Design a protein around this nucleic acid. Structure first.
Length: 89
DNA sequence: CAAGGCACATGACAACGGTGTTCAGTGCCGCGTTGCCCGATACCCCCTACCCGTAGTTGACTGGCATCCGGGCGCCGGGTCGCC
């Protein structure tokens, strides 16, 4: 939807708003996924705590890795998101 | 006995002696004042070796940490909920 909106060719206004709405719903689902995986990322932050970096800082950096991973994740892989994410985390 | 005539020496007279200056010229023989000559030195090039940053890696793997009491001591000062 956002790809089609990004193109310069003219689209109908109602169709453009529908595409924007679908992209917004995708954004909402993205944040749903991130909040779901917050627990995994804090677990992996535990896994590297106590090495001179504050635990919440490690959590935040892992969260950066998490947003990267979701930005690079899709169902085309026949695996759960948990297995794929942990590498990027 | 006085006056006039000859010896030696004498007031100056220059010119040599010997030696000290003079402006004069030209060198004599030590410092320099500069053209080379090289020699080294900064400064472009090419090559590759290695430091450092970026980007993947798919069974599954979904909430942690150990705190903290034997100050001690008092006050300020505010909050905080009972009180009637």
């Amino acid at each position: 939807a956002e790809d089609k909106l990004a193109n310069s060719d003219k689209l109908a206004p109602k169709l453009k708003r529908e595409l924007e709405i679908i992209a917004e719903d995708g954004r909402r689902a993205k944040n749903h996924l991130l909040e779901a995986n917050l627990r995994l990322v804090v677990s992996l932050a535990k896994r590297y705590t106590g090495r001179g970096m504050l635990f919440l800082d490690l959590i935040q950096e892992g969260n950066l890795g998490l947003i990267r991973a979701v930005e690079k994740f899709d169902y085309t892989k026949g695996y759960k998101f948990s297995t794929y994410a942990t590498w990027w985390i």
